[PDB]
């Protein structure tokens, strides 16, 4: 069922505040043409339409779209946006001469100005919609050409980016295992802790990490102008950055509680993405609030690991990771990730 | 394997019971007790602190092997022997076999408790009663060649399965209709029609709110778990009527139909009780949430739909004939039938 995932977007402030508030505050939308792409529940059509578009195509192929033109009719808007339940690829398929000549009234004069959409998935890519918004974008801007209009279509959101930092797992272990299987009613139970933990670390980890995990505060890996951005680029993401751990509050924070002789230990690296659009930012970082999304944890094998192999002394280092996010299949829907000291 | 044994010791009922039961019985010091599928161990920890002479822990997964270590790090060792086996596995043995390898620890004593947490999903399903029950049987043969005639002890020594009729509509406004009512000013009701609906669909463990009664429930089933033999847990079944004009329940619910209006029954939950001494461990849904939840069984989406199982304002009696029934010859699997009367 499709309204299983979209009641999590609706329940997720963050998310509900950042489109709101980048619809209800954005110069091109009011009198304007709106395109939503995957629109599901279509609140993001809705909102478009309430802040006074012109018109809205609200893009649904799944039969979640039939309902929606039942609540776009509840709400009394059944004028304003127009439900197309059928996937962005296939609307394509049928060409931009048909799509102009039957929407030319809705359509206007100036074609479509914004696209809207929430495309991303896990660590942004992973299971995500991306591809289908650069797709209807392409699609949009050849439309919005047959009428003889260039201006480039405006993307909410308009920028993305994948952060990355090295994480420690102690504080993981400490607040999830071996506070819990301390104490059983006077029982020591902890050997039970660290077998739950171990285990639990080698079965990518998709999980909301503690802040004090964090070693650093993090590095942009992967930067995308959505207006930009081709389908090319999606085969392989990469890049290679340089964590400065002498310059780093949160790595003082863990020398200090190893003492002055003490040794800190990397055990991975978790990602995160942001995305923004003119001053609002919706980010999945551990130090905002959760989301379905939470946050991918890569970790370095066991022996790396319980030998503590990636450690600094406690005045710091550099530690260099080299990441790749790369497309399993030709669907760019679906991503691993990799990486290499 | 772990995981799930954490829910158990993160449970304060569950806990709380168990813990009261070892400490009230007058079987356990001095004496030996075995505990049947002890997980963690927690039970027999529990026995040997309450000064049991020893304790056969009976544990046939993987957890066995540390259930030894954690045992030693309470220096519980003398008192405490982990069979990494199963009970069927044991008795295969045979009473012989099975006095000679133990006969120190037997000594005069043989058994005179036997500890256990076995419920499944409304008391039946995916539970290890069928197990339980064997074990006892097996123990009390030991006993008998040891000169012991004495009932083991059970805990828990009685169980129940209550049942009581349900209405959805607290559910329904609850779990959705209050959510998707509005959704930043918009009307989004619609959806959670289609989402409540769908979901109905057979029988469904959840926890439902209290107030989803229409009385406050009926014993169904009732076992003596020191008798009870395998032979009845292939069809339990029973008969019982609810008289909705002398429950409290139901008034909550007259109440608010109105005095011409009716109170329509969606269906019957059902969950239970087990109990020994004067404590009582409930899954009742006016009981704190447990791992079990409750199970109920929904009337046909026509009934529901057309409220063709109703009452005035004045109540009235309903009648229901429940059969639990085993779907193959384990007696772990079990369906839920009923027939209203």
Redesign the interface.
């Known amino acids: ?1 499709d ?1 299983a995932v ?2 999590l977007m ?2 997720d402030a963050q998310r ?1 505040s950042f489109y ?1 508030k980048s619809i209800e505050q954005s110069a091109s939308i009011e009198g304007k043409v709106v395109v939503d792409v995957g629109s599901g ?1 279509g ?1 993001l059509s ?2 478009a339409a ?1 802040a006074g578009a012109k018109h809205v195509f609200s893009i649904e192929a799944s039969s979640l779209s039939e ?1 929606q033109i ?2 776009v009719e ?2 009394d808007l059944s004028t304003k946006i127009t439900v197309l339940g059928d996937t962005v690829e296939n609307i394509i398929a049928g060409g931009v001469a048909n799509f102009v000549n039957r929407h030319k009234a809705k359509l206007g004069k100036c074609g479509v100005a914004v696209l809207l959409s929430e495309w991303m998935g896990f660590y942004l890519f992973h299971e995500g919609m991306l591809p289908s918004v650069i797709r209807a974008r392409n699609f949009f801007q050849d439309v919005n050409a047959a009428l003889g209009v260039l201006q480039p279509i405006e993307m909410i959101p308009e920028r993305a980016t994948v952060f990355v930092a090295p994480i420690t797992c102690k504080p993981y272990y400490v607040q999830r295992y071996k506070n ?1 299987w301390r104490d ?2 006077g ?6 802790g660290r ?2 933990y171990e285990v639990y670390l080698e079965q990518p980890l998709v999980e909301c990490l503690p802040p004090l995990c964090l070693l650093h505060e993090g590095l942009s890996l992967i930067e995308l102008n959505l207006s930009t951005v081709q389908e090319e680029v999606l085969t392989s993401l990469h890049n290679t950055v340089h964590f400065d751990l002498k310059e780093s509050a949160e790595f003082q924070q863990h020398a200090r509680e190893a003492g002055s002789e003490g040794r800190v230990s990397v055990d991975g690296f978790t990602v995160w993405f942001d995305v923004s659009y003119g001053a609002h930012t919706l980010s999945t970082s551990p130090r905002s609030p959760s989301t379905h999304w939470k946050q991918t944890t890569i970790l370095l094998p066991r022996e790396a690991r319980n030998e503590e192999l990636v450690s600094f002394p406690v005045e710091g280092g550099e530690l260099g990771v080299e990441m790749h996010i790369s497309a399993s299949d030709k669907t760019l829907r679906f991503y691993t990730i990799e990486l290499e000291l």
């Open positions: 069922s309204l979209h009641r609706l329940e509900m709101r529940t609140i809705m909102w309430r309902f039942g609540v509840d709400n819990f059983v009613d029982l020591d139970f902890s050997r039970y077998i739950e």
